[PDB]
Amino acid sequence: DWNFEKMGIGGLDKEFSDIFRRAFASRVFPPEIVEQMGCKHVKGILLYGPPGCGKTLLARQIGKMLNAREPKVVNGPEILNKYVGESEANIRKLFADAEEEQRRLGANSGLHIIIFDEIDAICKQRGSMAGSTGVHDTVVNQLLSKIDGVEQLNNILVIGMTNRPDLIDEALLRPGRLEVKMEIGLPDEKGRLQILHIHTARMRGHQLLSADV
Amino acid sequence: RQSIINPDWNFEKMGIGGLDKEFSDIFRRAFASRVFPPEIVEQMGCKHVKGILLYGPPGCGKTLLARQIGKMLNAREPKVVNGPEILNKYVGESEANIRKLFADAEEEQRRLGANSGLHIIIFDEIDAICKQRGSMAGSTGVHDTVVNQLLSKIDGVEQLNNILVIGMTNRPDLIDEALLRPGRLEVKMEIGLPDEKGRLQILHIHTARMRGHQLLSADVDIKELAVETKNFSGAELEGLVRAAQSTAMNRHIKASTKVEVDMEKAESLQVTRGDFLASLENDIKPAFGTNQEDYASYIMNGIIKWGDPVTRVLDDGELLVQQTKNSDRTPLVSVLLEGPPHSGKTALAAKIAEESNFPFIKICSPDKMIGFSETAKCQAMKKIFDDAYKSQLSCVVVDDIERLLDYVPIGPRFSNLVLQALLVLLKKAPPQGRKLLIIGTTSRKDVLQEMEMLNAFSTTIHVPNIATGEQLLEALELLGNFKDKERTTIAQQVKGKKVWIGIKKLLMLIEMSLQMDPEYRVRKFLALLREEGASP
Amino acid sequence: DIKELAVETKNFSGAELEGLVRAAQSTAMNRHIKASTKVEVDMEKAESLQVTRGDFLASLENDIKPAFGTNQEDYASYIMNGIIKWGDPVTRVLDDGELLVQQTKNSDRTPLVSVLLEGPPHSGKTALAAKIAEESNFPFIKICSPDKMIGFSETAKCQAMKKIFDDAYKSQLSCVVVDDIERLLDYVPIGPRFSNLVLQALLVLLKKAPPQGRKLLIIGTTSRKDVLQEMEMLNAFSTTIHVPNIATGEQLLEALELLGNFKDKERTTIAQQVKGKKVWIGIKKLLMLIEMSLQMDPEYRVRKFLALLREEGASP
Amino acid sequence: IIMDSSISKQALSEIETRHSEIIKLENSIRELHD
Ligand SMILES: Nc1ncnc2c1ncn2[C@@H]1O[C@H](COP(=O)(O)OP(=O)(O)OP(=O)(O)O)[C@@H](O)[C@H]1O
Ligand SMILES: Nc1ncnc2c1ncn2[C@@H]1O[C@H](COP(=O)(O)OP(=O)(O)OP(=O)(O)O)[C@@H](O)[C@H]1O
Ligand SMILES: Nc1ncnc2c1ncn2[C@@H]1O[C@H](COP(=O)(O)OP(=O)(O)O)[C@@H](O)[C@H]1O
Ligand SMILES: Nc1ncnc2c1ncn2[C@@H]1O[C@H](COP(=O)(O)OP(=O)(O)O)[C@@H](O)[C@H]1O
Ligand SMILES: [Mg+2]
Ligand SMILES: [Mg+2]
Ligand SMILES: [Mg+2]
Ligand SMILES: [Mg+2]
C-alpha cells in the first residue's frame, strides 16, 4: 500500500523515474524470467546538488517505500576512533546482518538498506606518489573490499548523499559499486507551486486559511 | 598420485575471455611442476614457486581470475583476508593474527611429509598493510612489525613446501622491495585493457543464457557492438548489457504511482537494438575512451569556410596524423598552432583531434586549475600524460600555453617548475611500440622562442586573420545576416580599403550591432568596424 | 655451457640464479603437457626430458630481471636506431672514448677521470655516451637522466644524485653518465635563473676521489658550452670532446645511401641540386625530414624533401 | 593533529578467599569444626 501522491515530495517528478528504472526495476518483474535472464541487481546510488533542496527526504521516502528492513544509518564522522584498528571494526559491523542472511538463505533474503550520510567526509581520494594520508587509506580500503570482493553479496544497497561530486575516490565510482548518480537542482515555477500546495494543504483542510490568499 | 587439478575442469567453464596469454604463463610457471610425475621432479631437485602478484587499472578482472584459480584446485578451501582485517589495538595481537594463517600447513607438513595438499592464501588489497619498511614515520609502529613477521614467516629458517600466496594491488610501487625477490613472490602480472578479440569473447560469454532461452532477438549483431565500443573494460561491458536489459524490462511494466504489470507484454519479452543504442548514448561512459562533451564546449558554432587559409590547416593536420599512425622511427610527433589573438585557434585543434578517430583523446586546459599552486599543476599534467601512456594510440591537446606558465609582461614573471615539467615531457618516448601526438596552442610566439621552447616542437602552423574584404563579405553571407540592399551598401563601403579582424570578434560585433532599431544597424556596424580595424 | 651463463648474467645474486634455473626447468617441462579442455601429460615422450640452451636464453630474456644496475632495455631505449657511419667524425669520438676508458683502468696516480661531450643541439650526443659506456664492459654501469625526476624539487634531485653516486663507491670500477646537464640544474635565458643547490652538489661531487684502490669514470653531456664556462664549471672536467654536424654534400649523400631511402634516379636528382652548396643539419633532424617527406603520393617526393631542407637553412 | 595510540592491559589476581569465603572459612572453622 503505497503511492507517490502520499510520498510528500514535490518537484522531483523526473529525477525519480530513473531511480525506479535502474535500481528497483529488477525486483518487481516475475522472478522466474529474471532468473532465466541471469542478471545482477545494482548495489549503489549517489545523489548530489546544492544544499537544502530535498535530498534526505528522498532517502527516507525510498527507505520506507519498500518492504525492506528498517534502514541503518552511519552519521558521517561517527566511525573515527583513536585506537589502532577501531574504524575498520565499525565499518565491518554494518555488513554483518547482510552476510549472515546471505549465508543462511539464498536468493530469498529481504533487501537491506544502508543510508550513508556525508560520504565526502571520509571517503577521500587515496592518492599516490609516496606519502600516507593516515587513517583514511585504511577505511577506504576496508570499504572498497566489502561491497565488491571475493565473496559475493546480492541483497544489499547503498545510498550516498553529498554536494561535492569531484572529491570522492575514483575507484569507488565505477559500474559495480555506486553506479547510478543523480543531480537534484533548484526547482522552477511548477516545483514551487507543488511545494507550497503540499506545505499548506493541512491548514487549508480546516478552513484556517482565508480566501484572500 | 591424486591429481592436484580437480578431476573435471575445462577452460570453457571458467568464464574468462581475453586473458589467454596471461593465464597460460601463470599455469606454466606456477602449476607445471605439480602435474608432472613425481619421480622425475624428485630427481631434478627443485622447489615449487610460492608467490603470485597481480596489478593493473581498476575493473579489468583480477579478483575474478584469483577466485576462479582458487576454485580450480580441488584441495581444501581458500583462506581469505579482506584487506586490513588483521589489526587490533592491544600490544602484540596483529602478529598473532598473521601467524594463525600458516599454522595448518606447518602442522600438516610434519604429519604427512611430502604428500601434503596445496594450501592457498588470498591477500586482497595487499597495499593496505605491506608498504615500505620505514616510510611510515609517526605511527605506533605496527606496520614494521607486521612486515617483519610476514617476511620471516614466508621464507625463514624452517622451510615450507605446500603454500601459495596471491596478491592484488592497484599501485605496484609502494610495496616493499624485500618482499619481491625470486624467493617469495616471483610471478608478477599486469591485467590491461582488452583488444577487439577480447571484447568479442567477453560479449559472447555474458550474453549466452539469454541466447539459450530465446530471450535475445535476432535483430542484434554482436560484431557491430564489438567494433563500435573502443577502450571499454570488462566491467563497462557488463554494465552496458545490464542497462539494456533493465530498459527492456522497464518497457513492459506500467505505472509508477501504483505498481502494475501486464502479463500480455511479459510473456513476449525481447530486447532490440534500440535499447542497446539508448544505453550506449546515455548511461555508460568509459574512462579511457573518448567523450562527446569535450567537443561541444570548445567548437561551439561549427566551422565555416570563409576562405582558402581555412582548409590548409586541416589538410596539414591530417598529414601529421597520417605520419604518426603509419610509421616507425618516429613514435612521437608534436605541432604548435600559433597566431594573433581572437583568431580561432582553439577550435581548429579540437576539430583536428576529433577528425583523427584515435581511441584516446584528451584536452588539458587551464579552466580546471583555478587557484592551483605550481606543484598541483605539475601533478595534474603528469597524471594526464601517465593515463595517455596506457593505449595503443593517443592524442593530447595543450591549450593556451602562455596561461599555464603564468606569464606576465611586467618583470617578466612566470613559473619554472611548470616550464621544465613541460620541456622534458615533449621528448620522452612512450613505452614499447605505442604512438602519441601532442598539439599545442599559443598566441605569443616571440616569448616562447626566447625561452628556447621552439626546439622541442617539430613544426609550426600559422592561423591568419581576415585580410581581404571579399573574405569578410563571404563570412557575412555564410553566417546568415544582413542581406539584400544592406549587403550591397556594406560592400560599397568596404571593398575600397583593407580590413584586419579576427573571426571570434566578428561574431561579437554582429551581435552587438543588432540591438538597435531596424534603421541604424548598418551605420553602427560600420562605426564599430572602423573604430576596431587598426590595420598594423 | 656453464661459462657462457656465468659471463652473461651481470649483477645477479644467488636467488636470481636459482630462479633462472627453475624457470628453465619449468619451461622445458611444459612441452609434454597439453592444456586442452582437460589436462593431459604425455607418458611416451616423457622420461626423455632434456633441457636445451635455447630455453636458458628464453628464460633469461623473458622471466628473470635483476635489480642492481642497468639492463638491456635502457640501452635499447637510448641508442634507438643504431649508429651509422656518415664520415670520419664518427670514429674519432669513439677512439677518444676508448683511450680514456683504457686510461681509467691501468693507472693509480689518477683514480678519477671526467670528460665532457659538447656540440650543437640535435646532433647525437646522448647516443654516443651510451655506446662508450656499453663498450667498456665495466661491472657496474648506471645512467642518471632527468626524465625520471619530473616535478621533483631541488632537495629530491640532490638526494637522487647522491644515492646514485653512492651506489658506485661499492664496486671495483664503474662508469656513470650525466646527460643533459643544462636541464638537471634548471636554466632559462631570461633572468638568468637556476638552482644553486644542484650546481654546488655537482661541483663538489666531480672532485671526490673514491675509497682506497677503487676507480670511477664520469661522462657528461651538454649543449650550451658557454654558460657552463661562465659558471666556473668547465675547469673541473679533465678534457673535452666535440660532436659536429653534417657539413658537406658528400656526407649527406653517404648518410642517405646508408639509411636506405631515395634510391636510383632520385638519388642522382638530389645530387644535382645538393652538390652546389654546403649544408648544416644535425643527424636527428635528418631522420625526421625523411619521414615527413615520405607521406605524399608516389610522385611529388623529392620536391618536398628539397623544399624542407632549403627552409631549414642556417650557418654558424 | 593525529596520533593513534595502543593500549596494554593487566590481569587481576582473583582470590576466592578475599571476601565472602573468609566468612566461609569461619563457617568452616568456627562452625563445622566446632
Ligand atoms: N572557421 C572557423 N575557424 C575557427 N573558429 C571558427 C570558425 N568559424 C566559426 N568559429 C567559431 O569561432 C570561435 C573560435 O575561437 P575561440 O572561441 O575558440 O577562441 P580562441 O581562438 O581560442 O581565442 P583566444 O586566442 O582569445 O584564446 C569558436 O566559437 C568557433 O566556433
Ligand atoms: N652516427 C650516429 N650518431 C648518433 N646518433 C645516431 C647516429 N646514426 C643514427 N643516430 C640516431 O640519432 C639519435 C640520437 O640522437 P639524440 O636524440 O640522442 O640527440 P641529442 O643530441 O642527445 O638530442 P637533444 O639534445 O635534443 O636531447 C638516435 O635515434 C640514434 O639512433
Ligand atoms: N521537493 C521537495 N518537496 C517538498 N519539500 C521539500 C522538497 N525539498 C526540500 N523540502 C523541504 O526541505 C526541508 C528539509 O530538507 P532536507 O532534508 O534538510 O534537505 P537537505 O538534506 O538537502 O538539506 C524539508 O522539511 C522539506 O519540507
Ligand atoms: N576477462 C573477463 N571476462 C569476463 N568478464 C569479465 C572479465 N573481466 C572482467 N569481467 C567482468 O567485470 C567484473 C570485473 O570486476 P572484478 O574483476 O571482480 O573487480 P576488480 O577488477 O577490481 O578485481 C566482473 O563482475 C566480471 O563479470
Ligand atoms: Mg542532510
Ligand atoms: Mg576486487
Ligand atoms: Mg586560445
Ligand atoms: Mg641530450
Q: Is B258 on the interface with C (CB under 8 A)?
A: no
- Return the closest-CA partner of residue C1 out of C53, C60, C47: C53
Q: What ligand 1 atom has the least distance to the C-alpha of B443?
A: 25
CA angle C205, C209, C211 (to 5 degrees): 120
Report d(CA B363, CA B395) in Å as an integer: 9
How far is residue B168 CA from its own chain's centroid?
Answer: 20
Partners of C301 in beta bridges:
none
The alpha helices in B262-356, defined as continuous H runs, are: 263-267, 273-282, 309-325, 346-354
* C82 assigned ligand-binding residue: yes
Give chain B positions within 8 Å (CB) of C18.
182
Which stretch of DSSP H or E encloses residue C26? helix C14-29
Report d(CA B378, CA C150) in Å as an integer: 8
Strands, sheet with A112-117, edge to edge from the N-terminal-most edge strand: A72-75, A112-117, A156-161, A45-48, A180-183
Q: How many CA atoms lie within 13 A of B380 on its CB side?
A: 18
Confirm if B366 and B406 have CB atoms less than 8 A apart: no
Q: Which phi and psi angles does B120 have, rounded to 5°?
A: -100, 150
Report d(CA C55, CA C29) in Å as an integer: 11
CB contact under 8 A, B87 and A83: no
Does chain D reach chain C with at least 3 CB pairs under 8 Å?
Answer: no
Which stretch of DSSP H or E encloses residue B509? helix B503-512
DSSP characters for B219-239? Answer: T--HHHHHHH--S--HHHHHH
The alpha helices in B155-272, defined as continuous H runs, are: 196-206, 209-212, 222-228, 234-252, 263-267
Residue recorded with cell 656526407: C251
Residue recorded with cell 614573471: B413
Q: Pairing state of beta strands A45-48 and A156-161? A: parallel
Report d(CA B120, CA B135) in Å as an integer: 30
Q: What is the dihedral of CA A166, A168, A169, A171, to 10 degrees?
A: -90
> Which three three-digit cell numbers place residue C265?
634516379
In sequence order, which residues have a C-beta less than 8 Å from that of residue B374 and are 6 or more positions away?
Answer: B415, B417, B418
Q: Which phi and psi angles does A179 have, rounded to 5°?
A: -85, -60
Report d(CA B250, CA A28) in Å as an integer: 10
> Which three three-digit cell numbers place residue B350?
579540437
In sequence order, which residues have a C-beta less than 8 Å from that of residue B481 and are 6 or more positions away?
Answer: B510
Residue C192: cis peptide before it, omega within 30 degrees of 0: yes
> Which three three-digit cell numbers place residue C290?
625523411
Report d(CA B438, CA B351) in Å as an integer: 14
- Return the closest-CA partner of residue A127 out of C12, B174, B327: B174
Report d(CA B348, CA B310) in Å as an integer: 9
Q: What ligand 3 atom has the least distance to the C-alpha of A191?
A: 1
Q: Which phi and psi angles does B397 have, rounded to 5°?
A: -110, 125
Cβ pairs bridging B and D (under 8 Å): 15
Does chain A reach chain B with at least 3 CB pairs under 8 Å?
Answer: yes
Report d(CA C29, CA C45) in Å as an integer: 11
Q: Cite the beta strand spans of C76-172 per DSSP E.
A: 112-118, 140-144
With the most atoms of ligand 1 within 8 angstroms of its CB, the residue from B444, B503, B506, B511 to mutate is B503
Question: In this structure, which residue's CA is closest to atom 14 in ligand 2?
Answer: C124
Confirm if B463 and B346 have CB atoms less than 8 A apart: no
> Which three three-digit cell numbers place residue A10?
514535490
User: Is the C-beta atom of C80 inside 6 A of ligand 2?
Assistant: yes
Distances (CA, A) of C210 to C104, C108, C173, C174, C214: 13, 12, 10, 11, 6
CB contact under 8 A, D6 and B139: no
Report d(CA C157, CA C163) in Å as an integer: 10
In sequence order, which residues have a C-beta less than 8 Å from that of residue B193 and are 6 or more positions away?
Answer: B57, B60, B231, B233, B288, B390, B391
Give chain D positions within 8 Å (CB) of A135.
2, 4
Q: Cite the beta strand spans of B67-146 per DSSP E.
A: 79-81, 119-123
User: Is the C-beta atom of C128 inside 6 A of ligand 2?
Assistant: yes
Interface of A with B in 172-201 (CB under 8 A): 174-176, 179
Residue recorded with cell 604429519: B111
Report d(CA C98, CA C87) in Å as an integer: 18
A25-63 CB burial, b ≥16 within 10 A, e <16: bbeebeeeebeebebebbbbbbbbbeeeebbeebbebbb
Residue type, B82: N
Q: Find the closest chain B residue to D9 by CA distance.
A: B90
- Return the closest-CA partner of residue B376 out of B340, B415, B414, B350: B415
Q: Is A128 on the interface with B (CB under 8 A)?
A: yes
Q: What ligand 4 atom has the least distance to the C-alpha of B62?
A: 23
Experimental approach: cryo-EM
B429-446 CB burial, b ≥16 within 10 A, e <16: ebeeebbbbbbbbbbebe
Q: What is the largest CA-CA distance in chain C?
A: 79
User: Is the C-beta atom of B59 inside 6 A of ligand 4?
Assistant: yes
Residue type, B523: R
Question: By CB neighbour count within 10 A (0-12 exposed, 13-18 middle, 19+ buried), where does C242 fall?
Answer: middle
Q: Which of B46, B177, B451 sits opposite C25 (nearest CB)?
A: B46
Q: Cite the beta strand spans of B110-232 per DSSP E.
A: 119-123, 163-169, 187-190
How does DSSP classify residue B74? -
Please identify every residue of C annotated as catalytic.
125-126, 179-180, 207, 284
Partners of C115 in beta bridges:
C219
Give chain D positions within 8 Å (CB) of B139.
4
Confirm if B167 and B55 have CB atoms less than 8 A apart: no
In sequence order, which residues have a C-beta less than 8 Å from that of residue A207 and are 6 or more positions away?
Answer: none
Confirm if B369 and B416 have CB atoms less than 8 A apart: no
Report d(CA C262, CA C272) in Å as an integer: 14
Which stretch of DSSP H or E encloses residue B332? none
Question: In this structure, which residue's CA is closest to atom 2 in ligand 2?
Answer: C83
Report d(CA C61, CA B532) in Å as an integer: 68
How far is residue B332 CA from its own chain's centroid?
Answer: 19
Interhelix angle B273-282/B234-252, rounded to 10 degrees, is: 120
Resolution of the experimentally solved model in angstroms: 3.6
Interhelix angle C89-103/C126-135, rounded to 10 degrees, is: 40
Residue recorded with cell 518492504: A67
Report d(CA A190, CA A194) in Å as an integer: 6
Cβ pairs bridging A and B (under 8 Å): 122
Q: Which phi and psi angles does B119 have, rounded to 5°?
A: -110, 125
- Other CB atoms within a 10 A radius of the CB of residue B310 amount to 17
Q: A53 C-alpha to center of ligand 3: Å?
A: 5
Report d(CA B285, CA A174) in Å as an integer: 10
How does DSSP classify residue B36? S
Q: What ligand 2 atom has the least distance to the C-alpha of B427?
A: 27
With the most atoms of ligand 2 within 8 angstroms of its CB, the residue from C93, C178, C283 to mutate is C283
Residue recorded with cell 586482497: B124
Q: Is C205 on the interface with B (CB under 8 A)?
A: no
Interface of B with A in 374-403 (CB under 8 A): 379
Report d(CA B280, CA B277) in Å as an integer: 5
Q: Is B23 on the interface with C (CB under 8 A)?
A: no
In sequence order, which residues have a C-beta less than 8 Å from that of residue D12 and are 6 or more positions away?
Answer: none
Question: In this structure, which residue's CA is closest to atom 5 in ligand 2?
Answer: C124
Q: Find the closest chain D residue to B142 by CA distance.
A: D6
Of how many residues is chain B composed? Answer: 536
Report d(CA B198, CA B194) in Å as an integer: 5
Confirm if C242 and C128 have CB atoms less than 8 A apart: no
- Return the closest-CA partner of residue C58 out of C27, C17, C89: C27
Report d(CA B89, CA A86) in Å as an integer: 8
Residue type, A53: C
Q: What is the dihedral of CA A121, A127, A131, A135, to 10 degrees?
A: 30
Partners of B361 in beta bridges:
B395
Confirm if A173 and A181 have CB atoms less than 8 A apart: yes
Q: Which phi and psi angles does B352 have, rounded to 5°?
A: -65, -45
Confirm if A19 and B256 have CB atoms less than 8 A apart: no
CA angle A143, A146, A148 (to 5 degrees): 110
Please identify every residue of B annotated as catalytic.
345-346, 399-400, 427, 504
Q: Is B258 on the interface with A (CB under 8 A)?
A: yes
Report d(CA B313, CA C295) in Å as an integer: 16
Positive or negative: CA dihedral C3, C7, C9, C10? positive
How far is residue C18 CA from its own chain's centroid?
Answer: 31
How far is residue B381 CA from its own chain's centroid?
Answer: 14
Residues measured by CB to lie within 5 Å of ligand 5, the ion:
A 56
Q: Cite the beta strand spans of D1-34 per DSSP E.
A: none
Q: B474 C-alpha to center of ligand 1: Å?
A: 17
Residues of A contacting chain D (CB within 8 angstroms):
82-84, 134-135
Chain B adjacent subunits, 3+ CB pairs under 8 A: A, C, D
Q: What is the largest CA-CA distance in chain A?
A: 69
Question: Gaps after which residues in chain C, C–N over 2.5 Å?
Answer: none
B143-166 CB burial, b ≥16 within 10 A, e <16: beebbebbbebbbeeeebebbbbb
Report d(CA C218, CA C116) in Å as an integer: 9
Residue type, B118: L
- Other CB atoms within a 10 A radius of the CB of residue C149 amount to 18
CB contact under 8 A, D5 and A134: no
Which stretch of DSSP H or E encloses residue C194? strand C193-194
Q: How many CA atoms lie within 13 A of A49 on its CB side?
A: 16
Q: How many CA atoms lie within 13 A of B9 on its CB side?
A: 16
CB contact under 8 A, B424 and C18: no
